[PDB]
Design an enzyme around this catalytic site. Structure first.
Site, PDB file in Angstrom:
ATOM      1  N   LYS A 186       0.723  -1.129  -0.009  1.00  0.00           N
ATOM      2  CA  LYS A 186      -0.077   0.163  -0.229  1.00  0.00           C
ATOM      3  C   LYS A 186       0.974   1.324  -0.012  1.00  0.00           C
ATOM      4  O   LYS A 186       0.509   2.232  -0.646  1.00  0.00           O
ATOM      5  CB  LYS A 186      -0.936   0.142   1.357  1.00  0.00           C
ATOM      6  CG  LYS A 186      -1.892   1.348   1.264  1.00  0.00           C
ATOM      7  CD  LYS A 186      -2.623   0.942   2.539  1.00  0.00           C
ATOM      8  CE  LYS A 186      -3.429   2.248   2.804  1.00  0.00           C
ATOM      9  NZ  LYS A 186      -2.731   2.962   3.624  1.00  0.00           N
ATOM     10  N   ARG A 245       2.187   1.794  -3.744  1.00  0.00           N
ATOM     11  CA  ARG A 245       1.107   2.046  -4.392  1.00  0.00           C
ATOM     12  C   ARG A 245       0.696   3.670  -4.389  1.00  0.00           C
ATOM     13  O   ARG A 245       0.305   4.280  -5.188  1.00  0.00           O
ATOM     14  CB  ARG A 245      -0.152   1.177  -4.322  1.00  0.00           C
ATOM     15  CG  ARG A 245      -1.391   1.795  -5.079  1.00  0.00           C
ATOM     16  CD  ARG A 245      -2.597   0.699  -4.951  1.00  0.00           C
ATOM     17  NE  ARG A 245      -2.976   0.659  -3.531  1.00  0.00           N
ATOM     18  CZ  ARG A 245      -3.870   1.611  -3.024  1.00  0.00           C
ATOM     19  NH1 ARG A 245      -4.315   2.625  -3.433  1.00  0.00           N
ATOM     20  NH2 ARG A 245      -4.091   1.398  -1.896  1.00  0.00           N
ATOM     21  N   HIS A 298       2.371   6.077  -2.607  1.00  0.00           N
ATOM     22  CA  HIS A 298       3.561   7.175  -2.690  1.00  0.00           C
ATOM     23  C   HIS A 298       4.690   6.840  -3.543  1.00  0.00           C
ATOM     24  O   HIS A 298       5.479   7.928  -3.490  1.00  0.00           O
ATOM     25  CB  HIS A 298       4.114   7.179  -1.279  1.00  0.00           C
ATOM     26  CG  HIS A 298       3.176   7.381  -0.152  1.00  0.00           C
ATOM     27  ND1 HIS A 298       2.391   8.604   0.115  1.00  0.00           N
ATOM     28  CD2 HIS A 298       2.767   6.652   1.029  1.00  0.00           C
ATOM     29  CE1 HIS A 298       1.762   8.430   1.109  1.00  0.00           C
ATOM     30  NE2 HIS A 298       1.730   7.196   1.637  1.00  0.00           N
ATOM     31  N   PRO A 336      -7.600  14.066   0.966  1.00  0.00           N
ATOM     32  CA  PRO A 336      -7.289  15.367   1.387  1.00  0.00           C
ATOM     33  C   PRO A 336      -5.710  15.428   0.724  1.00  0.00           C
ATOM     34  O   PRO A 336      -5.687  16.561  -0.025  1.00  0.00           O
ATOM     35  CB  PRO A 336      -7.367  15.577   2.647  1.00  0.00           C
ATOM     36  CG  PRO A 336      -8.538  14.795   3.175  1.00  0.00           C
ATOM     37  CD  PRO A 336      -8.217  13.491   2.279  1.00  0.00           C
ATOM     38  N   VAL A 337      -4.879  14.985   1.165  1.00  0.00           N
ATOM     39  CA  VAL A 337      -3.528  15.052   1.096  1.00  0.00           C
ATOM     40  C   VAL A 337      -2.897  13.821   0.662  1.00  0.00           C
ATOM     41  O   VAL A 337      -3.074  12.624   1.055  1.00  0.00           O
ATOM     42  CB  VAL A 337      -2.706  15.837   2.067  1.00  0.00           C
ATOM     43  CG1 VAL A 337      -3.371  17.230   2.354  1.00  0.00           C
ATOM     44  CG2 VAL A 337      -2.903  15.069   3.294  1.00  0.00           C
ATOM     45  N   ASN A 338      -1.692  13.794  -0.335  1.00  0.00           N
ATOM     46  CA  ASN A 338      -0.884  12.722  -0.443  1.00  0.00           C
ATOM     47  C   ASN A 338       0.366  13.060  -1.228  1.00  0.00           C
ATOM     48  O   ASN A 338       0.362  14.223  -2.015  1.00  0.00           O
ATOM     49  CB  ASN A 338      -1.392  12.014  -1.633  1.00  0.00           C
ATOM     50  CG  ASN A 338      -0.753  10.251  -1.530  1.00  0.00           C
ATOM     51  OD1 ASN A 338      -0.537   9.679  -0.826  1.00  0.00           O
ATOM     52  ND2 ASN A 338      -0.118  10.075  -2.816  1.00  0.00           N
ATOM     53  N   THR A 339       1.406  12.431  -0.623  1.00  0.00           N
ATOM     54  CA  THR A 339       2.922  12.754  -1.330  1.00  0.00           C
ATOM     55  C   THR A 339       3.397  11.663  -2.005  1.00  0.00           C
ATOM     56  O   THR A 339       3.111  10.408  -1.915  1.00  0.00           O
ATOM     57  CB  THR A 339       3.875  12.979  -0.226  1.00  0.00           C
ATOM     58  OG1 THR A 339       3.166  14.175   0.638  1.00  0.00           O
ATOM     59  CG2 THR A 339       5.295  13.341  -0.654  1.00  0.00           C
ATOM     60  N   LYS A 379       5.514  11.569  14.803  1.00  0.00           N
ATOM     61  CA  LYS A 379       4.242  12.527  15.134  1.00  0.00           C
ATOM     62  C   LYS A 379       3.755  11.949  16.115  1.00  0.00           C
ATOM     63  O   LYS A 379       3.246  12.742  16.977  1.00  0.00           O
ATOM     64  CB  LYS A 379       3.244  12.839  13.786  1.00  0.00           C
ATOM     65  CG  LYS A 379       3.182  14.263  13.221  1.00  0.00           C
ATOM     66  CD  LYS A 379       2.306  14.856  14.483  1.00  0.00           C
ATOM     67  CE  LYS A 379       1.622  16.265  14.187  1.00  0.00           C
ATOM     68  NZ  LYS A 379       0.545  16.086  13.439  1.00  0.00           N
ATOM     69  N   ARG A 394      -2.614  18.377  -2.827  1.00  0.00           N
ATOM     70  CA  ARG A 394      -3.589  18.827  -1.649  1.00  0.00           C
ATOM     71  C   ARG A 394      -4.993  19.179  -2.387  1.00  0.00           C
ATOM     72  O   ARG A 394      -4.894  20.014  -3.402  1.00  0.00           O
ATOM     73  CB  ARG A 394      -2.622  19.940  -1.233  1.00  0.00           C
ATOM     74  CG  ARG A 394      -3.506  20.569   0.215  1.00  0.00           C
ATOM     75  CD  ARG A 394      -2.558  20.376   1.124  1.00  0.00           C
ATOM     76  NE  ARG A 394      -3.193  20.540   2.304  1.00  0.00           N
ATOM     77  CZ  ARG A 394      -2.736  20.146   3.415  1.00  0.00           C
ATOM     78  NH1 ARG A 394      -1.652  19.755   3.978  1.00  0.00           N
ATOM     79  NH2 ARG A 394      -3.883  20.445   4.552  1.00  0.00           N
ATOM     80  N   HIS A 404       4.603   3.753   6.397  1.00  0.00           N
ATOM     81  CA  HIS A 404       3.717   5.000   6.325  1.00  0.00           C
ATOM     82  C   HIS A 404       4.830   6.261   5.976  1.00  0.00           C
ATOM     83  O   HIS A 404       5.687   6.036   6.331  1.00  0.00           O
ATOM     84  CB  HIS A 404       3.070   5.245   7.805  1.00  0.00           C
ATOM     85  CG  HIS A 404       1.896   4.353   8.163  1.00  0.00           C
ATOM     86  ND1 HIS A 404       0.665   4.486   7.413  1.00  0.00           N
ATOM     87  CD2 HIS A 404       1.998   3.461   8.916  1.00  0.00           C
ATOM     88  CE1 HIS A 404       0.170   3.428   7.827  1.00  0.00           C
ATOM     89  NE2 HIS A 404       0.904   2.912   8.679  1.00  0.00           N
ATOM     90  N   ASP A 412       5.399   9.655   7.451  1.00  0.00           N
ATOM     91  CA  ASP A 412       5.165  10.495   8.307  1.00  0.00           C
ATOM     92  C   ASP A 412       5.338  11.894   8.002  1.00  0.00           C
ATOM     93  O   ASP A 412       4.213  12.768   8.360  1.00  0.00           O
ATOM     94  CB  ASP A 412       6.249  10.025   9.416  1.00  0.00           C
ATOM     95  CG  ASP A 412       5.525  10.391  10.852  1.00  0.00           C
ATOM     96  OD1 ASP A 412       4.808   9.954  11.533  1.00  0.00           O
ATOM     97  OD2 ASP A 412       6.077  11.679  11.165  1.00  0.00           O
TER      98      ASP A 412
END
Length: 116
Positions: A7, A10, A12, A34-37, A58, A77, A111, A113
């Protein structure tokens, strides 16, 4: 079905662009996220971050790692106007240090972060 490592890849990895890629990678086919990098480095150089600088996540867990160097990334964004089904993204390219949480054996990113 996907593992957490799959995941992460796929969502990032990618060794307007955000509207197209968020749809292509199944992030906005059934929701607007909402957001993804996206990271434009090779998968192996991103996996290499899991043995670089250990830092707290975080959420205060300690399995996060910051890259020694900056990496080429695109931030996606949602605009203030975006609403499913017509998701809409602001695309911002940057070269930033990435912080990933790692797990498993092999110890690989699961993940994203943050970037710095």
């Amino acid at each position: 079905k996907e593992t957490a490592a799959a995941k992460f890849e796929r969502q990032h990895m990618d060794s307007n662009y955000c509207n197209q890629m968020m749809k292509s990678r199944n992030l906005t086919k059934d929701r607007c996220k909402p957001v993804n990098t996206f990271v434009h480095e090779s998968l192996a150089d991103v996996q290499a971050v899991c043995s670089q600088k250990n830092v707290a996540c975080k959420n205060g867990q300690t399995n996060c790692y910051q890259s020694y160097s900056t990496m080429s990334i695109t931030d996606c964004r949602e605009t203030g106007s975006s609403k499913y089904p017509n998701c809409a993204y602001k695309t911002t390219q940057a070269n930033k240090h990435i912080i990933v949480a790692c797990e498993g054996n092999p110890y690989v990113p699961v993940h994203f972060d943050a970037s710095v």
